C-alpha cells in the first residue's frame, strides 16, 4: 500500500540519484509501488500515467539508450536542467515581490503565483509581506486588472501555446460587436492599462486592442507553433504611437482668471498677466492636442477661462454655450 504522492516522490528521487539510464523493468523491480501490479500491462499503464503526470509538472525527463553496448531505452532526469540558477535578493526586491503577489483574484492565477512564490522562497530568499504593511482595497471594481482578468489569462495561454485568437470586440457601447481573429504577439501595459498587440487576419495590420472592450470569449484556434512574430518589432513603441498621434496640434492663447483652473494652470506652456473686463488673470499660450478635449476643458470652467486664439475654438465654445443656454429644448 503506497500512496500516489509517495510513489511519485520515490520515482523522482530514484531518477535524480542515478547517473545511468534506467529501463522500465529495473524501475518496476527497485522503486517501491511498482511491485503490486497484478500484471505487466497494468504496471505499464500505471507507469505511463505517472510519467505523463511528471512530464506535465514541468520536470525535464530525458530518454536515451542505457549504453553503447545495449539497446533498451532508459530514463533520466538532468540535474543541471532541473535546478534554477541561484539568485540574490535584497530587501527592496523581496518587498516588491510580496506586494505584487497580492494582485490577482482568479483561482488559476492565484495558484500559479503562489507556486512561483513558494519556489522563489525555497530558492533561499526571504519574501515577507507584513513588513511593508500595504494591502489591496479594490478587488471587484477594477476595469483593467480585475475586469480584464480572464481575458488576459486566455491571451497569455494562447501566446504561450503559439496559437491565434478569435474574439468579439466593440469599439464602444453604441457600436456593434464584431468578430476579430488575430495572431497575437504579446501584451503591453501603459498607464496601468493592458493593450493586446496583434496582427489581424481580416485586415492585415498591426493593431492594439484595449482588454476592457474585449469580452471573455477569447477562443484560441490554430496549430501550436504557427505564430512566428518578428523579433525586431518593438511592441512598446507601437503602443506609445497608438496612444497618441497628434503631438501638440497648434499653439493657442487662452485667458484664465487667477486663482482657478489649476488643472489648466499645470498645462500652461507660457503665461503673461493681463486684466480684461474688470477681471485679472493670465493669458497662456499652450498646446492643442485633441480639439474636443481642450474644448470641453475650456467650456467646463465657464467665465473662469476665456479663449482668445484661435478664433475657431472660440466660435465652437460660444456655439456650445449658446446651445446650453437655449433652455434644453434642443
Amino acid at each position: 500500500a503506497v500512496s500516489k504522492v509517495e510513489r511519485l516522490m520515490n520515482l523522482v528521487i530514484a531518477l535524480l540519484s542515478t547517473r545511468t539510464y534506467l529501463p522500465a523493468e529495473k524501475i518496476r523491480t527497485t522503486v517501491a509501488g511498482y511491485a503490486d501490479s497484478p500484471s505487466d500491462e497494468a504496471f505499464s499503464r500505471m507507469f505511463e500515467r505517472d510519467k505523463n503526470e511528471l512530464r506535465d509538472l514541468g520536470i525535464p525527463l530525458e530518454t536515451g539508450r542505457v549504453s553503447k553496448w545495449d539497446s533498451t531505452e532508459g530514463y533520466r532526469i538532468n540535474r543541471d536542467s532541473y535546478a534554477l540558477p541561484p539568485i540574490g535578493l535584497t530587501a527592496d526586491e523581496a518587498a516588491a515581490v510580496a506586494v505584487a503577489t497580492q494582485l490577482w483574484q482568479s483561482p488559476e492565477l492565484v495558484t500559479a503565483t503562489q507556486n512561483a512564490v513558494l519556489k522563489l522562497r525555497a530558492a533561499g530568499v526571504d519574501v515577507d509581506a507584513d513588513g511593508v504593511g500595504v494591502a489591496i482595497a479594490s478587488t471587484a471594481t477594477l476595469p483593467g486588472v480585475r475586469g480584464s482578468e480572464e481575458v488576459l489569462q486566455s491571451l497569455l495561454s494562447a501566446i504561450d501555446e503559439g496559437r491565434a485568437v478569435q474574439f468579439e470586440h466593440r469599439p464602444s457601447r453604441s457600436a456593434d460587436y464584431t468578430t476579430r481573429t488575430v495572431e497575437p504577439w504579446g501584451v503591453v501595459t501603459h498607464r496601468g492599462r493592458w493593450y493586446l498587440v496583434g496582427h489581424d487576419r481580416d485586415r492585415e495590420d498591426t493593431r492594439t486592442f484595449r482588454l476592457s472592450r474585449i469580452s471573455a470569449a477569447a477562443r484560441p484556434i490554430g496549430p501550436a507553433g504557427a505564430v512566428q512574430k518578428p523579433q525586431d518589432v518593438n511592441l512598446r513603441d507601437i503602443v506609445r504611437r497608438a496612444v497618441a498621434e497628434q503631438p501638440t496640434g497648434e499653439r493657442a492663447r487662452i485667458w484664465i482668471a487667477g486663482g482657478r483652473a489649476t488643472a489648466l494652470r499645470r498645462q500652461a506652456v507660457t503665461s503673461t498677466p493681463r486684466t480684461i473686463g474688470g477681471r485679472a488673470g493670465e493669458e497662456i499660450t499652450v498646446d492643442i492636442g485633441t480639439w474636443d478635449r481642450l474644448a470641453r476643458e475650456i467650456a467646463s470652467y465657464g467665465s473662469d477661462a476665456v479663449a482668445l486664439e484661435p478664433s475657431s475654438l472660440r466660435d465652437d465654445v460660444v456655439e456650445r454655450l449658446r446651445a446650453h443656454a437655449a433652455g434644453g429644448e434642443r
Partner: protein
Amino acid sequence: SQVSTRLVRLLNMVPYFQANPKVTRAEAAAALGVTGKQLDADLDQLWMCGLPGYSPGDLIDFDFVGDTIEVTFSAGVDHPLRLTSTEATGILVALRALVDVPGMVDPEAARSAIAKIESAVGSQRAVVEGITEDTSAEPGAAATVRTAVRENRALTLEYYSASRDSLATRTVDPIRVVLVGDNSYLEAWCRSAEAVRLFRFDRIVDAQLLDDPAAPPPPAVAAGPDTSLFDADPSLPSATLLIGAAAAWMFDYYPLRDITERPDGSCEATMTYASEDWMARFILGFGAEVQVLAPESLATRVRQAAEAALQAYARCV
C-alpha cells in the same frame, strides 16, 4: 490537480529547510501557507521516502530538536524545482503592472526584480514589456510618502481638490497605501479636518517631511483597511442627465447608473456628484452632447452659468 501541487510543494520543502538551518514550526507554516496538521502530515510523509534501497542510512532523515527542523541527509535534493511558463509569466505580468502605479513600489526595485527573474528563467524579448525603461516621472514626493509610511513621520501635503478646484496644504499622518481601480490612493489622517482621507498621487504637487513622529488616533481607535466612509453613500446627491450617442467618452471613465436606451436619444442615465459646481462644469464641458433633465435647480444654475459665460465672452476680446 491538487495532487500535482502537493507533490511540487513536498518536493520543494527540502531545499527550503536546507536554506534555513533551524526554522521553527510557525515560520514554516507562515511561509508555506498551510495549517499545523497539514504541515505535520506532509513532513511525516516526506520523512519515510527517499533513495531506493530503503536502508535507514539511505532515506532522508531529519533531526528534531524540540520544535525545530533541520536536514541531515537530503539524498540529492539540493535545489528547488524550476519555474513553469505560466507561473513565471504571471509573476512578470504582475511586476510589470505594479511598476507604473505611483507609490506602491519603488521602480528601481521592480526593474531589478524583473532583470533577475528574466536572467534566472532565461526569458527573452518575447514576453510582456513596459513602456518606460526609465520613468523619471517620479517627482520625489512618492519616495517621501513611502519613507514616511515606513518611519511613521508627519507629512505635509499640497493637494489639489478638483471638486472645490483649489490647492490645500495639510499636515497629515499616513496609515496605509491601498489600490482602487487604476488610481492608487494614499490613506492618511488629517488633523486640519481630523478625518481619514484618500489622496491621489497625481494630484500631489510636492510633499514635505517633518520631524513629528506622532501616532495617529485611528491606530488607537479603529484601523480598518477599507474605511470607505463616503466612497458610496446615499446622502451623495445624484443628477439625472441625458447623454447623446456621440458622447460615449463618459460612458467608460464614470459610473453611470440607471442607463435607459432609446433610438431617439430621449432616454437618460443618473450619476452622483460631490458638489454642484463640479457637476455644472462636467455638464458644460460636453456642450450640446449632454442635455440636463433633473434636478430643475441644477438646470437653472447651468443655464445661468452659460449665460454669464456668454456675456463674459461678449465683453472680452
